[PDB]
Structure formats: C-alpha cells, structure tokens
Design a protein around this ligand. Structure first.
Ligand code: C9Z
Length: 280
C-alpha cells in the first residue's frame, strides 16, 4: 500500500497510520478520508509557528483523500493515562504555558480552534519531545479579516461544535464561539489534569441532546471556586478571567501566562524542563 507514489503505508497507530517516506527514509503519520481539503488549507496558513505540525503531502488515492504529516508522539490524554491520570503541578504549569501560546498563535492567524482538549495536543518525538503541538483544524473557523481585523458578528442558536466535556458555558448556550472560548476550554483542561476528571464527566442520557443539557446544567451549577477548591488560586483566576471576556475581546495572553509563571516561582520549582512521564 503506497500513497502519493512516495509514502509506504504502515500499521494503524491511532484512522491514523504510521508511514514511511521511501525517498527520505523518515517515518510519517497518514490520515485517510473516504471519498480534509479545507483542513489542509488551514494547516498551510498556520505553517511556521512553534508547535504547528508540517504537512508533507495531501491528495487523492483511490477512494480516499490522504494527508501526510510529520510524525508526532502520544497525545496529552495518552500521557495522562500513562501517568495514572495525575500530573504534578509542575507538569501542569509547564503545559499551561505552551498551550496558551499555541492558542495565541492560532488566534494571531485569524482562526479559532473550537475543539481544545487533551486529545488534540501531541508531544513531539526525539529532539522535539519537550514541545507541545496542536492538531486538528477540522472544526476551526476564521473569526476576523486578516488585514482589517474586523470580527465576525455575535450570533446565537449555534450547534455545539466541539467536545462537550471541555466546551465553554457560552458554547453550551449556543453562542458563536470566539477567542475567549478556546481559552475557557483550556481552563477546564488544566483543572482536568489537576483533578483526574471533571464533575460533569461521565454523565449519561438516552440521546446526545439530553446528555449535553446534563453536562451544561452541571457546568453551570458548579461555581469556579468549588471546581478549583484545594488548588492554587491561579486556576480559578484564569477561569474567571476567561468568563469575564466579551465576545469580541482580545485576551491578555501574557497576563494568563504570567499567572502560572508566578505560581511556578512561588512553588520553588526548578527550570529543569522535565515532564512527569519522563520521571515516573
Ligand atoms: C518508535 O517510537 C515511537 C513512539 C511513539 C510513537 C507514536 C506516534 C503516535 C501518533 O499518533 N502520532 C501522530 C498522530 C497524528 C494524528 C493525526 C493526523 C492528522 C493529520 C495527518 F496528516 C496525520 C495524522 N490525527 O490524529 C492523530 C493522533 C491524535 C492519533 C499526527 C502525528 N503523529 N502514537 C505513538 C504511540 N502510541 C501509543 C498510544 O498512546 C497511541 O495513542 C500513541 C500514538 C511512534 C513511534
């Protein structure tokens, strides 16, 4: 099995397959879509940013649309499970700094991601093992004009495009997603790493609609101070800041990063850039 006259298809690794660039000799990741183009154009617009994967090829192969990406490593959800679903505070703070910057970069390129979750952040392999990458622009959306920075308008009655567990409250309410919502989702991700789960995780119903209402109801009835009880105040400050942003507001990314850098300092952690999964 060969795609693009250049890549040998290997075994399933996640429908994601390991592949081999036959000419260069390097391994790649291959995504197959049964007869992706839109997503490739967003990746291309994002290319050249820290933690943005490079796309090596995209085309047509039989009854499949194919995309080939540089090989990355396990996702943060994979590594969370590998660490028995608990991260040290230091690892959470190291991840927070990078993840805020990845989201800022996407926003600087005029898009919102709309599905921020642990499964969409992958660690690099090899010399890039300490670098957090962001993937999956299949739900991303342009929120402003590149030159004038004129914002898309406020709208309601929007379907939940994302993952319910990490969706912002405004997303549950059907409001058009904007920059604030990517960051609020990240806030839930960070408390998820701290807690091992979220209070609304695992709620079930007969149909998705009832399930989402269940999650929305619990999310709305859980104050930030209760969610973050027993953890450094910075996590609540982060979430409160994100919920205070208006639809069109430009987030103060530097302030949010400084929250966690300040806590990093007060905790006495060392500048050795070692994550938990490398030191079980
Ligand atoms: C020999 O040493 C090694 C050590 C570790 C690994 C290695 C590499 C991977 C991996 O998935 N890479 C990867 C995946 C994607 C990708 C895309 C995508 C989008 C557009 C494209 F064009 C192409 C792909 N869409 O989704 C994904 C992910 C979320 C599945 C993109 C780039 N890279 N995984 C492992 C080890 N696994 C154990 C278990 O935890 C498994 O989950 C984990 C997965 C490989 C070798």
């Amino acid at each position: 099995l060969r795609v693009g006259n250049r890549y040998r298809l290997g075994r399933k690794i996640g429908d994601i397959y390991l592949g081999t660039d036959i000419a260069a000799g390097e391994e790649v990741a291959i995504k197959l879509e049964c007869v992706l183009h839109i997503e490739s154009k967003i990746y291309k617009m994002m290319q050249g940013g820290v933690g943005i994967p490079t796309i090596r090829w995209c085309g047509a192969e039989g009854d499949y649309n194919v995309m080939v990406m540089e090989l990355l490593g396990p996702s943060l959800e994979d590594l969370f499970n590998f660490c028995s679903r608990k991260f040290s505070l230091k690892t959470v703070l190291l991840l927070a700094d990078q993840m805020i910057s990845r989201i800022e970069y996407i926003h600087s390129k005029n898009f919102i991601h709309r599905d921020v979750k642990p499964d969409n952040f992958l660690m690099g392999l090899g010399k890039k093992g300490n670098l957090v990458y962001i993937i999956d622009f299949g739900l991303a959306k342009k929120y402003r004009d590149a030159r004038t920075h004129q914002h898309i308008p406020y709208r309601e009655n929007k379907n939940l495009t994302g993952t319910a567990r990490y969706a912002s409250i405004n997303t549950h309410l059907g409001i058009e997603q904007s920059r604030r919502d990517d960051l609020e989702s990240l806030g839930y991700v960070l408390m998820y790493f701290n807690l091992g789960s979220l209070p609304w995780q695992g709620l079930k119903a007969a149909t998705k609609r009832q399930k989402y209402e269940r999650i929305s109801e619990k999310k709305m009835s859980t104050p930030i101070e209760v969610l973050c009880k027993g953890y450094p105040s910075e996590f609540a400050t982060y979430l409160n800041f994100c919920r205070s942003l208006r639809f069109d507001d430009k987030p103060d990314y530097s302030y949010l990063r400084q929250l966690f850098r300040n806590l990093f300092h007060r905790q006495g952690f060392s500048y050795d850039y070692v994550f938990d999964w490398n030191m079980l």
